[PDB]
Amino acid sequence: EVNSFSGYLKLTDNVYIKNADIVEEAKKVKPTVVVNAANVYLKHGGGVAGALNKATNNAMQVESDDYIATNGPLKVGGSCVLSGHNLAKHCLHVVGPNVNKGEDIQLLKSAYENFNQHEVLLAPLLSAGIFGADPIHSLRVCVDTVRTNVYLAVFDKNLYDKLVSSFLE
Numbered sequence: 001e002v003n004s005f006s007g008y009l010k011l012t013d014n015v016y017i018k019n020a021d022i023v024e025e026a027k028k029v030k031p032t033v034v035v036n037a038a039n040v041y042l043k044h045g046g047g048v049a050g051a052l053n054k055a056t057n058n059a060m061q062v063e064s065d066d067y068i069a070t071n072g073p074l075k076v077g078g079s080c081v082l083s084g085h086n087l088a089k090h091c092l093h094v095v096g097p098n099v100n101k102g103e104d105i106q107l108l109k110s111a112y113e114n115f116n117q118h119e120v121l122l123a124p125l126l127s128a129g130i131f132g133a134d135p136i137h138s139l140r141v142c143v144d145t146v147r148t149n150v151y152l153a154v155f156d157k158n159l160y161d162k163l164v165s166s167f168l169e
């Protein structure tokens, strides 16, 4: 069926969260939109972006290279809509700031604002992992900024539990 999300915990009227791999969620749910945690040149070299690209058997990377050739790189805090391939109807490539590389944490609000152009999205926790943002802060920005229906997949039970505890304080 359409957007068949299961086993999520509803945090607010529009934010849900699950301990899950976003790739496995995209394969089972077939969401209208899957968010990729992209970089400005759409080079999906590892982490979340490498895993989504691998699940499309590199079709996502070829399409991203053609997009960059015609349009140039994205800006930090920006996004573009490309094909979802076998994972979704569309992939929304969003660039959150990479704090470990000196980018401004304030741009995380701009990054989440891109989600508001889509009614329902399956997404990762922006700027977390090796991008270096505090994951509790990233969830607070998501809850305060996103107004459409967002299903967050966080592939780590330890981090999932710390995020739910922090939200329910």
Ligand SMILES: CC(C)[C@H](Nc1ncnc2[nH]c(C3=CCOC3)cc12)c1ccc2c(c1)S(=O)(=O)CCC2
Residues within 6 Å of the ligand: 020, 021, 022, 023, 037, 046, 047, 048, 049, 051, 124, 125, 126, 127, 128, 129, 130, 131, 135, 153, 154, 155, 156, 159
């Ligand atoms: C915080 C962690 C748990 C989270 N990881 C994930 N969150 C959700 N679905 C995931 N699948 C995988 C797989 C990796 C290999 O096969 C699938 C990772 C994973 C995450 C959240 C955002 C970011 C990253 C990582 S990053 O890739 O380090 C840099 C970009 C921002």
